[PDB]
Chains A and B, each alone.
Chain A
């Protein structure tokens, strides 16, 4: 059952942390937060958007095309 203590062998790593009460829950909302939100957004939009944007069109086309084929062709009764 118990896993904490076996996990892995680690040496020479020091860490420093502060009580949740000595710091801010959401700090540097502008100087740090948002800037990264953008960073991340930026770096993934060209990977994600393409296939979706693509399908999007396929939708509109297929939709419009199906609808076009609804309308009547006057050339069928000009006789």
Chain B
């Protein structure tokens, strides 16, 4: 129930990738599926993700983080890739099942 729902919010703050200004999706490791997804992203979304990342890298080299006031809020995190990624994986699974057929 609303258990892991608050658990999640806890973890989200514990992980801390938002102190860098990243969304959950930004931190995704770029395997094949993700790279394919990133490709389908509308340009604005893609250009934005880039900047977020480039800024985070700059923050990391600097050994700093965003002011608490700019950290992304658990409920304002946009899973801009999540769906695309779903499809990509969905698409692949089909081909796979089909080729073993």
Contacts and interface: CB of A to CB of B under 8 A. Distances in A.
Q: Please tell me whether chains A and B touch each other in their complex, using a CB distance cut-off of 8 A.
A: yes
A36 B64 contact: yes
Contacts of A12: 47, 51
B86 interface: no
Interface in A1-38: 8, 10-13, 36
A11 B47 contact: yes
B63 A36 contact: yes
B93 interface: no
A72 interface: no
B51 A13 contact: yes
Interface string B37-77: 00000010001001100100000000110000000000000
Nearest to B62: A36
Main secondary structure of the interface of A (DSSP, over half): loop
Contacts of B43: 11
B56 to A, nearest CB: 13
A13 B53 CA distance: 12
Contacts of B54: 10, 13
B7 to A, nearest CB: 19
A69 B80 CA distance: 63
Nearest to A33: B63
Interface of A: 8, 10-13, 36, 40
12 contacts: A8-B50, A10-B50, A10-B54, A11-B43, A11-B47, A11-B50, A12-B47, A13-B51, A13-B54, A36-B63, A36-B64, A40-B63
